[PDB]
Design a binder for this molecule. Sequence first.
Ligand code: NA
Ligand code: NA
Ligand code: NA
Ligand code: NA
Ligand SMILES: [Zn+2]
Ligand SMILES: [Zn+2]
Ligand SMILES: [Zn+2]
Ligand SMILES: [Zn+2]
Ligand SMILES: [Zn+2]
Ligand SMILES: [Zn+2]
Ligand SMILES: [Zn+2]
Ligand SMILES: [Zn+2]
Lengths: 222, 218, 221, 218
Amino acid sequence: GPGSMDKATLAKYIDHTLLKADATEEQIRKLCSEAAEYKFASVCVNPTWVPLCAELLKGTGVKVCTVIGFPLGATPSEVKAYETKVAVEQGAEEVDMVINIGMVKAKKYDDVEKDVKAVVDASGKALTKVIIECCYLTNEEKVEVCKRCVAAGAEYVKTSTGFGTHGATPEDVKLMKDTVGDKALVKAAGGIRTFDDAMKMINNGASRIGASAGIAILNGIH
Amino acid sequence: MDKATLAKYIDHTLLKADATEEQIRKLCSEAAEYKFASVCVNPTWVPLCAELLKGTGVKVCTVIGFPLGATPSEVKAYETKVAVEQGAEEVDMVINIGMVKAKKYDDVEKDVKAVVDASGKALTKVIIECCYLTNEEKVEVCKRCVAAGAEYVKTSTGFGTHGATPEDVKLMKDTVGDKALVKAAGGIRTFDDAMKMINNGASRIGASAGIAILNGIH
Amino acid sequence: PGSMDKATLAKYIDHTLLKADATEEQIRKLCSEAAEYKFASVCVNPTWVPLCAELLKGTGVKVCTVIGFPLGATPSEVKAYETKVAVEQGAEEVDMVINIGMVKAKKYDDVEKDVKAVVDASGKALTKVIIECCYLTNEEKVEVCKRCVAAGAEYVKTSTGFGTHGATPEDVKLMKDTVGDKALVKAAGGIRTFDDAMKMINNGASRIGASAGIAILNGIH
Amino acid sequence: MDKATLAKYIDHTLLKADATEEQIRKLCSEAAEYKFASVCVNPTWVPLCAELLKGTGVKVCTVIGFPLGATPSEVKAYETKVAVEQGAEEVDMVINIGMVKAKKYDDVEKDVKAVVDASGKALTKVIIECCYLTNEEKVEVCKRCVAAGAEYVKTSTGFGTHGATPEDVKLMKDTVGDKALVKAAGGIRTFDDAMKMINNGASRIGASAGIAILNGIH
Ligand code: NA
Ligand code: NA
Ligand code: NA
Ligand code: NA
Ligand SMILES: [Zn+2]
Ligand SMILES: [Zn+2]
Ligand SMILES: [Zn+2]
Ligand SMILES: [Zn+2]
Ligand SMILES: [Zn+2]
Ligand SMILES: [Zn+2]
Ligand SMILES: [Zn+2]
Ligand SMILES: [Zn+2]
């Protein structure tokens, strides 16, 4: 049988992340080196660092993931689409966009779907994840946003940016996964620091984990 | 300092990710009533604010590559082009801090120049995000902003570890002299806060507490 | 299950008032609140120690005060005397500020001596050392924390709340990674919400300095 | 009014918590070059400044219970005793504002007298921190400073919400008459700012901008 969670298996959940505004070339290179050694699913970096990461990770099995309209989501759809086009051109294999929360609060859900669809269209062969930023949403809004992401064709819905008031909760992961079922996957991100934290998210339906602490998580397996 | 004069220093700001249309409408209403210099809003709200503020003397200001600054120059440029097309009269861009930390200051200048070019008739302010910079970095970034043709250098996004300090404003103003103007932003809550910035060289104040600032004159 | 509740969270909080123009009435209110909500401590300037010690007799709430605060730029013997007087007057914890000039000169044996002077003066009172992260490099934060453990301080503390900024979750984690279980970490300054507080606690903080403790308790979610 | 005369109004000040040995050496070098009245530094730097300023005619001034004033009188007195032993020639203490707000003015007076007695040959200045006081409180505190034997009353720490105002300087001088002198500090940036405070009764000026103040004479 598959037995207990192990290093090889858990590593493939991890998007090894560095998104601080003042991140340096040296830190980005170290992130890539770490991800290649630990065989993480991806690195997740801001769009400026995409082509460097793509070069460094060619052949390693580690994907380049980036963030779109991040972390506020408060820019026009055409701008999110353009940033997506450029990121994929430059080597991004996954893009994680932030929703327009103003549209959600206005109940303009057809516009939310169109905003996601603009990024989905621009992504091409790259996978699209949509950050719904749970900390600012009601449960009704979480559910309806997830439905619109599936309708727009996004492969993933994602809990949080890590920059808001709070990040992933197991309850949110479960609500999101119950909403999308097998039609989309769930990424839990923000405040995930330990092996036990990661497992709680995975046990509630997460197929991917966004973290800066991937090393600590992988090395805490027992 | 009287209220009308102080009001024209103020960029009445709402940049929260979860800001609502109702809040943006109130922001515009307040700016027009109190005759603030501008509203400062995320790019999604430019069309609405441009329509609401037509004829009021209040400018529409938006933020570019914000708040992290960590996206290609061409993306900052495109966002700027769209914003100006949609009615933005000022654009406040965030620098690529990675370039600064690499000491690639020619690259920092080109990144600014990309947004300056795209701004057209709109004024460009450059957010240098002082809280993450050394003093040497603040000075050199400011010099590159002038070289690139930006009208303003700006202390902060309001999303970093801290915002405007009077010492940062003075350093920035000493560097640019009369070749550019300085905007202080982030954490400015009172009249006394605003005046510390103005007296150290700020020509503009970014705040949410504008009404309280006007009413706190003493 | 295992989520934070109000009784547990309250014991992280040092209910703080340090403004130069704080009033007797405000200090009395601070004590009354801390007693009612069973906060860990009140944190007040040394002048208010005897009043707080009297008010909090029989409550479980500790009297914490601040030493060489907020600038840290006075001789060790003066920090030590202020500590002695504070403890004599009823202080149960003292929170000193480091001499930052020593750190910038890379005179870390002198930083250790400065902390040890306060630790020696503290007697029965616990010592916390404010390192004022906003003014320090990461290398400096690490070395200062090491010297605090060497001197025998029970706590290292992020910030005064009077500098350019206060506690960051990254600073809390760096400090805790440095001291391990040899010392505890207090996060202070700019902590306004339950979410702010939890970011600090989840990164290693055993105590939270704040003025908004009632709202923090009310904000659990 | 000329440069040498104005220079002797100025206490050349650096009190930031993160001030460095290099910066304090530069402060002393500048004060000796421009012949300012004093340097004003935190108590930790008194021995170095005393050594550096020997024979220059510049006094070493330091601050006591600063900037909050919220520590017992015996502690302010001990800090004062150490400072003077270490070479301080002037000490600038901060009042206990909680005492003022409780109208415990005999206790305010005792607090000042503790530092006065401890100062010995060094002159004592008392920072009343006007920004936190009512006008009635400023007047009463100034009377108590005279009663306790302080040579100076001083407007501000420069760390509070606002610094010297001409109206406060005037009120303070009107209260003390010729029985004490007034020092204006906080926010004094230019020649005309300094002259305005002097016009209102200031005999001393606390500032970091002394060189610019002298160079702005007109
Ligand atoms: Na795609
Ligand atoms: Na332009
Ligand atoms: Na002790
Ligand atoms: Na004397
Ligand atoms: Zn990503
Ligand atoms: Zn929350
Ligand atoms: Zn476990
Ligand atoms: Zn703006
Ligand atoms: Zn304390
Ligand atoms: Zn002095
Ligand atoms: Zn004021
Ligand atoms: Zn003039």
